[PDB]
Amino acid sequence: SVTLRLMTEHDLAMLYEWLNRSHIVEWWARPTLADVQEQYLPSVLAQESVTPYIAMLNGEPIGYAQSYVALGSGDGWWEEETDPGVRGIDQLLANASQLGKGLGTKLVRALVELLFNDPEVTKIQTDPSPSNLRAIRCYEKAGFERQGTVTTPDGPAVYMVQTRQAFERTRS
Ligand SMILES: CC(C)(COP(=O)(O)OP(=O)(O)OC[C@H]1O[C@@H](n2cnc3c(N)ncnc32)[C@H](O)[C@@H]1OP(=O)(O)O)[C@@H](O)C(=O)NCCC(=O)NCCS
Ligand SMILES: NC[C@H]1O[C@H](O[C@H]2[C@H](O)[C@@H](O[C@H]3O[C@H](CO)[C@@H](O)[C@H](N)[C@H]3O)[C@H](N)C[C@@H]2N)[C@H](N)[C@@H](O)[C@@H]1O
Numbered sequence: 001s002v003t004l005r006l007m008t009e010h011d012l013a014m015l016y017e018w019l020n021r022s023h024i025v026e027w028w029a030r031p032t033l034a035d036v037q038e039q040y041l042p043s044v045l046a047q048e049s050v051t052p053y054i055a056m057l058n059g060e061p062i063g064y065a066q067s068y069v070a071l072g073s074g075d076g077w078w079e080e081e082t083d084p085g086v087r088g089i090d091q092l093l094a095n096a097s098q099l100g101k102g103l104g105t106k107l108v109r110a111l112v113e114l115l116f117n118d119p120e121v122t123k124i125q126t127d128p129s130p131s132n133l134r135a136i137r138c139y140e141k142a143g144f145e146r147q148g149t150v151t152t153p154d155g156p157a158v159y160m161v162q163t164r165q166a167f168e169r170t171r172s
Pocket of ligand 1: 023100102104106132133135
């Protein structure tokens with residue numbers, strides 16, 4: 001069972017290592033330690049309405065995740081959003097030897113549950129790139145539905161949603 005804790009300043013050097021592992025680099029640019037400290041400091045992320053978490057498994061950190069207020073995004077992101085209740089997610093697994101063993105699906109399921117525990121939250125979104133079939137499949141298994149293609153400042157994305165109603169019906 002995978003759980004989530006908030007990321008702290010103390011996790012930044014570990015995150016920096018992960019973001020230079022080649023299984024991560026291919027989908028996530030190759031940040032220096034200072035890049036990571038400037039960009040992923042929780043109080044800096046806070047300014048773009050981003051919350052970082054660390055995924056835990058048997059007491060060990062196994063990945064990184066982010067939630068964000070879509071409406072709170074700016075610089076070209078989700079310009080058409082009108083609903084303050086929408087959240088987006090992103091995530092990664094730290095260890096290549098743990099890829100494709102269902103852990104990503106548990107991580108996403110844990111992150112979806114936490115977010116719907118914000119009573120103001122209406123819907124979760126994700127935006128994997130079209131090439132990223134493994135991320136798209138993992139999200140599907142976690143209850144996300146493919147809507148269609150959207151343009152983002154990083155490029156096209158397969159836009160996927162899970163509503164609160166859908167979550168209510170499947171959680172049992
Ligand atoms: C995305 C990520 C979190 C998913 O976690 P994961 O543990 O690998 O995914 P899961 O094991 O839970 O399931 C993934 C599914 O993708 C499928 N799959 C793997 N590679 C695939 C491919 N190239 N094409 C189609 N399906 C693929 C698997 O079959 C599996 O589903 P299954 O149970 O039906 O067999 C993880 O792979 C990761 O950190 N990747 C690197 C960075 C990244 O892509 N982050 C996401 C950015 S949107
Ligand atoms: N899925 C994996 C992807 O995760 C991140 O992409 C995220 C952005 O982080 C997030 O943007 C937020 O953080 C930015 C700072 O980076 C701010 O500009 C922005 N205002 C703020 O809303 C978008 N809303 C959603 C997008 N999927 C990585 N960057 C990218 O490399 C990787 O492929």
